[PDB]
From a paper:
In humans, not all of the >170 alleles (“subtypes”) of HLA-B*27 are associated with AS: while the prototypical HLA-B*27:05 subtype (B*27:05 in short) is AS-associated, HLA-B*27:09 (in short, B*27:09) is not. Both alleles encode a heavy chain (HC) that associates non-covalently with a light chain, β2-microglobulin (β2m), and a self- or foreign peptide. The B2705 and B2709 complexes are distinguished only by an Asp116His exchange within their HC, located on the floor of the peptide binding groove within the F-pocket. In the present work, we extend the structural analyses of complexes with pGR and related peptides to the B2709 subtype, taking functional studies with CTL from B*27:09+ individuals into account.
The structure of the pGR-B2709 complex exhibited very high resolution of 1.2 Å and was refined to R/Rfree of 0.129/0.149. pGR-B2709 crystallized in space group P21 like B2705 bound to pGR, or both subtypes in complex with the sequence-related pVIPR and pLMP2 peptides. As the calculated electron density map is of excellent quality, two conformations of the pGR Cα-backbone, designated A and B, could readily be assigned, between the two arginine residues at position 6 (p6) and p8, although the overall difference exhibited by both peptide Cα-traces is minimal [root mean square deviation (r.m.s.d.) of 0.2 Å]. From the electron density, the ratio of conformations A to B was estimated to be about 70–30%. In addition to the difference between the Cα-backbones of the peptide, double conformations are also observed for the side chains of four peptide residues, pTrp4, pArg6, pTrp7, and pArg8. When the nona-peptides are neglected, the structures of pGR-B2709 and pGR-B2705 superimpose with an r.m.s.d. of 0.3 Å for the Cα-atoms and must thus be considered virtually identical. Both pGR peptide conformations assume the “p6α” binding mode (i.e., main-chain ϕ/ψ torsion angles in α-helical conformation at p6) in the B2709 subtype. In B2709, pHis5 engages in a direct contact to the backbone carbonyl of pTrp7 and an indirect water-mediated contact to pArg3NE as well as a further indirect interaction to HC residue Asp77 which is located on the α1-helix. The comparison of the newly determined pGR-B2709 structure with those of pVIPR and pLMP2 reveals that pGR is presented by this subtype in a further distinct manner, which is dictated by the presence of the NC conformation. On the basis of these results, the presence of molecular mimicry between pGR, pVIPR, and pLMP2 when displayed by B2709 must be regarded as highly unlikely.
Author numbering:
A (entry chain A): 1 to 213, 215 to 276
B (entry chain B): 0 to 99
C (entry chain C): 1 to 9
Write the structure that this text describes.
């Protein structure tokens, strides 16, 4: 179906403890494929998926230099932000950047992104037009003015519409075994006595990819308010897990149905407790 | 500065079967700032050589990390994860429950 | 693949 590529970047200052730590990772869909950590000894961007390993040394050299350059410009930008926000040099601060693209089933650009946050809050974002900016505050407006003067958006647009989509297409082909495979959830319901009067029914979804996915109904009515739904969580082997639970009075289990939607499933699943 | 306390889940990669090797995971998410310390514990003692993912973040800018180690669950061994973050006065201990 | 970014905040 549709796909995405994202590059995530975080720099965290540590006054009195050297220069900021810089960590960047790249994803295609919900698959990590590259990483760089500035605190590694002679840091390089490293592969994290089999299908990127085939890129040649010139790829890794360029990626590594881009990462080092970004670490360095983030250092300067963190200093700038102290000025813009009238902050002291004493505290640790955080600068985040995400950029990338979404493509449709046929591979055309659906949306591009390039956005920043400072101390966990929106700072500046390239709008969906890939031509104008949204600044969160009067500090980010200073950046906006500079980036309007320098015609930054047009340069970003050219990358997002061109290389970002082209390289994502390449990765999807090279990674077609995995990136183009949905693994459906393995599903079951478990029963957990609380007392002789009631028990928890827990509906499990295990081993699924991608992460997007669970509801309980009682007599066909969504039990939104009474369902404990955990955040989708990584298994550590590419796949994800999730569960949803409801407390059920003794003898009432057959009123309850668990409903599962996942792109890996041809039709939504309906499940019940099976003693 | 606005801070966000971590969500914490501790769980296994595969459904637990006593005596069978598995992975113990502690997933911390939804937090800000990114500074965090996580231990995995066996019978109250820190497990050595625990690995973790590289720092990443969600759409809303909040951070997430996975800490993990091989383990072989048994009937009597107790596992847990201990999380410290600036939002916590006291580090939080979450016990592993094979049914969650 | 990544792009370069020459423009400071």
């Amino acid at each position: 179906g549709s796909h995405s590529m994202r590059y995530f970047h975080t720099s965290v200052s540590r006054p009195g403890r050297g220069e900021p730590r810089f960590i960047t990772v790249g994803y295609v869909d919900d698959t990590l494929f590259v990483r760089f950590d500035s605190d590694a000894a002679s840091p390089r961007e490293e592969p994290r998926a089999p299908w990127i390993e085939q890129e040649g040394p010139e790829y890794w050299d360029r990626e590594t230099q881009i990462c080092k350059a970004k670490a360095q410009t983030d250092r300067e930008d963190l200093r700038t932000l102290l000025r813009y926000y009238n902050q002291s040099e004493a505290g640790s601060h955080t600068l985040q950047n995400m950029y990338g693209c979404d493509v449709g089933p046929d591979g055309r650009l659906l949306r591009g992104y390039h956005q920043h946050a400072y101390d966990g809050k929106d700072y500046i974002a390239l709008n969906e037009d890939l031509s104008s900016w949204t600044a969160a505050d009067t500090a980010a407006q200073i950046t906006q003015r500079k980036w309007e003067a320098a015609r930054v958006a047009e340069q970003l647009r050219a990358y997002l519409e061109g290389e970002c989509v082209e390289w994502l297409r390449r990765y999807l082909e090279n990674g077609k075994e995995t990136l183009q495979r949905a693994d459906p959830p393995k599903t079951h319901v478990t029963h957990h006595p609380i007392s002789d009067h009631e028990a928890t029914l827990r509906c499990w979804a295990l081993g699924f990819y991608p992460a997007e996915i669970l509801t309980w109904q009682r007599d066909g009515e969504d039990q939104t308010q009474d369902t404990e739904l955990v955040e989708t969580r990584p298994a550590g082997d590419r796949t994800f897990q999730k569960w949803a639970a409801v407390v059920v009075p003794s003898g009432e289990e057959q009123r309850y149905t668990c409903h599962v939607q996942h792109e890996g499933l041809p039709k939504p699943l309906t499940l019940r407790w099976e003693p | 500065m606005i801070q966000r306390t971590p969500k914490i889940q501790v769980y296994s990669r595969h459904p637990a079967e006593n005596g069978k090797s598995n992975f113990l995971n502690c997933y911390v998410s939804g937090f800000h700032p990114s500074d965090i310390e996580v231990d995995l514990l066996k019978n109250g003692e820190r497990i050595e050589k625990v690995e973790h993912s590289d720092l990443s973040f969600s759409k809303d800018w909040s951070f997430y990390l996975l800490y993990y180690t091989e383990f072989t669950p048994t009937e009597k061994d107790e596992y847990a994860c201990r999380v410290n973050h600036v939002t916590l006065s006291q580090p939080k201990i979450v016990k592993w429950d094979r049914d969650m | 693949r990544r792009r370069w970014h020459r423009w400071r905040l």
